[PDB]
UniProtKB/Swiss-Prot annotation:
<feature type="zinc finger region" description="TFIIS-type">
    <location>
        <begin position="8"/>
        <end position="48"/>
    </location>
</feature>
<protein>
    <recommendedName>
        <fullName>Transcription elongation factor A protein 1</fullName>
    </recommendedName>
</protein>
<feature type="binding site">
    <location>
        <position position="15"/>
    </location>
    <ligand>
        <name>Zn(2+)</name>
    </ligand>
</feature>
<feature type="binding site">
    <location>
        <position position="40"/>
    </location>
    <ligand>
        <name>Zn(2+)</name>
    </ligand>
</feature>
<comment type="similarity">
    <text>Belongs to the TFS-II family.</text>
</comment>
<feature type="binding site">
    <location>
        <position position="43"/>
    </location>
    <ligand>
        <name>Zn(2+)</name>
    </ligand>
</feature>
<feature type="binding site">
    <location>
        <position position="12"/>
    </location>
    <ligand>
        <name>Zn(2+)</name>
    </ligand>
</feature>
<comment type="function">
    <text>Necessary for efficient RNA polymerase II transcription elongation past template-encoded arresting sites. The arresting sites in DNA have the property of trapping a certain fraction of elongating RNA polymerases that pass through, resulting in locked ternary complexes. Cleavage of the nascent transcript by S-II allows the resumption of elongation from the new 3'-terminus.</text>
</comment>
<comment type="subunit">
    <text>Interacts with EAF2. Associates with UBR5 and forms a transcription regulatory complex made of CDK9, Pol II, UBR5 and TCEA1/TFIIS. Part of TBP-based Pol II pre-initiation complex (PIC), in which Pol II core assembles with general transcription factors and other specific initiation factors including GTF2E1, GTF2E2, GTF2F1, GTF2F2, TCEA1, ERCC2, ERCC3, GTF2H2, GTF2H3, GTF2H4, GTF2H5, GTF2A1, GTF2A2, GTF2B and TBP; this large multi-subunit PIC complex mediates DNA unwinding and targets Pol II core to the transcription start site where the first phosphodiester bond forms.</text>
</comment>
């Protein structure tokens, strides 16, 4: 009950598995382009990629 998709491109930094979700948002406006964040659906370890 969050707003992301199961992608499994990056591993977590704890559970060391492949069940991470990512979202592609672009901070303030849709003309100030994308940022890719990756969040583990398992323990909740999150980091970014861009
Ligand atoms: Zn984790």
């Amino acid at each position: 009950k969050t707003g992301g998709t199961q992608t499994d491109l990056f591993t977590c930094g704890k559970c060391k598995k492949k069940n991470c979700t990512y979202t592609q948002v672009q901070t303030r406006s849709a003309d100030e382009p994308m940022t890719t964040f990756v969040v583990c659906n398992e323990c909740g370890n999150r980091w970014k990629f861009c």
